[PDB]
Scaffold this motif. Sequence first.
Motif, PDB file in Angstrom:
ATOM      1  N   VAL B   1       0.847  -1.181   0.000  1.00  0.00           N
ATOM      2  CA  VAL B   1       0.000   0.000   0.000  1.00  0.00           C
ATOM      3  C   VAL B   1       0.886   1.235   0.000  1.00  0.00           C
ATOM      4  N   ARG B   2       0.388   2.310  -0.590  1.00  0.00           N
ATOM      5  CA  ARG B   2       1.038   3.609  -0.578  1.00  0.00           C
ATOM      6  C   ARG B   2       0.000   4.658  -0.234  1.00  0.00           C
ATOM      7  N   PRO B  26       5.647   9.943  -0.478  1.00  0.00           N
ATOM      8  CA  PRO B  26       4.581   9.107   0.076  1.00  0.00           C
ATOM      9  C   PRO B  26       5.137   7.868   0.753  1.00  0.00           C
ATOM     10  N   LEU B  28       5.375   4.057   2.035  1.00  0.00           N
ATOM     11  CA  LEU B  28       5.132   2.751   1.446  1.00  0.00           C
ATOM     12  C   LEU B  28       5.092   1.696   2.536  1.00  0.00           C
ATOM     13  N   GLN B  29       4.000   0.948   2.593  1.00  0.00           N
ATOM     14  CA  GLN B  29       3.923  -0.183   3.497  1.00  0.00           C
ATOM     15  C   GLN B  29       3.623  -1.433   2.693  1.00  0.00           C
ATOM     16  N   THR B  30       3.845  -2.581   3.320  1.00  0.00           N
ATOM     17  CA  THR B  30       3.329  -3.852   2.841  1.00  0.00           C
ATOM     18  C   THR B  30       2.439  -4.422   3.929  1.00  0.00           C
TER      19      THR B  30
END
Lengths: 298, 49, 187
Positions: B1-2, B26, B28-30
Amino acid sequence: ILSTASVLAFERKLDPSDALMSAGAWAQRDASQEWPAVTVREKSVQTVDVANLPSDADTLKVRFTLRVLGGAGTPSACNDAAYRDKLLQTVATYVNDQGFAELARRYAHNLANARFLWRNRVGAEAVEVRINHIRQGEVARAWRFDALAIGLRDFKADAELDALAELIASGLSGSGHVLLEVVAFARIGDGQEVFPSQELKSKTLYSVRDAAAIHSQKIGNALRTIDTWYPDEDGLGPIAVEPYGSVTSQGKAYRQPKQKLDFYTLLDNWVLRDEAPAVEQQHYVIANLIRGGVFGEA
Amino acid sequence: VRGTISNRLKTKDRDPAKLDASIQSPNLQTVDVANLPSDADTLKVRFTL
Amino acid sequence: MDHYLDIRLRPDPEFPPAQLMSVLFGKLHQALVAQGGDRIGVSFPDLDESRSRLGERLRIHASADDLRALLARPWLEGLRDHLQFGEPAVVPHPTPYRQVSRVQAKSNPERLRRRLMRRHDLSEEEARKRIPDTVARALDLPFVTLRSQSTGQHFRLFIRHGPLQVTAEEGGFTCYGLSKGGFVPWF
């Protein structure tokens, strides 16, 4: 004194799924239940993941489901009960004065024109979106749109867009279970490149089970792209409903808090000090409540 | 996800150029995600008591 | 070619202007292979030569009937929500002329190595000896990132604007709208 509650977690209404992309031929869009999926194949340049259609397929079927839930202004977590009751009175005042008839109309547009087809839409010769209202397992009501005759820019009135608008209105109010199956056929061309969503081998593409897909949040961002009430210079169209309503393509946050037009200032003026904003900005605030999020200070 | 930044700012971060410089990077996750399969409409939840 | 048509990119929250220019140039390429002839030329009237950015405008130089054929052709279907058109309009005068050419580079030594091993039956080490890694020269040019339909490769099509002139010389144009010798008015 009615300060804003220290926690406000709103759950996300308008729940989409991951948008699976398959492949096949135009003029058999109606037989698109056994179409072969689009596979993410690795090619050597560095090693990149790239997804295309097969060499005999010119039509990209992107299929997902959408749950329009209801109960928008009710938070999932809230410390101050007086703030929660005042916020619920404000949201109920909005729905009683003017229900989800502009918001669901704009969401029905973003379903109708295939904005959820993000980069697979830009040079497509024909895009066609089928939205089926699934009730007890079968199609209760079926729509079939031309996603290129309905623009991405303007929100034009129609006859079936209004019916889908009242459907998403009833689902958004709480007077019904709305689940929609949204199928969209992008006639790109034989073997042309499709653009599934992308992961973090310089490029990884998102796939669920050997089948390419767009993320559910990218589809949901393409549904929420309804905000035209922002201070509009430069000729930019609708943007996504975000607090401090920002675009990362331009590096610029429209609805800055130096103006009184971000979600937080409009919400704190609407519920605490009873300064109700305009119909447009309160459409935007209720759209941020449908979008969900973590509001409230720390 | 961003994502962009969408949390409340604390009146020192509300500068326009600083807000644009914050949304230019922005996060950034996972995330872990559990979904139903594309051909399954029912979630079974089986426990014992 | 006294008629023109400017195609200005709208700003978009979703896509950058470079990618929309790439899609528009690809669709223009298909429209020019479909139409045929050699009397269609392009320009980039918002060119920033300092940063090598092609700008947000694409001007199409042609005859009157060619532009009235192109404005009603379905190559812009799917692109109309990202562009805005003017009208087919006559050019001003006096207007300087410049050449808009496709400039390619030898930015990959391994492909030249494959060519010399195909053309002189050499080895890998002899070809690597004759072709070092210093011959890979990059361009300081603006470009469109296109993909082909004959093959399946993604290529950068670098566009260079020539020096300004007082008159134009005869010649045709490629099917990408760029010049094989012809000149377009710049204004």
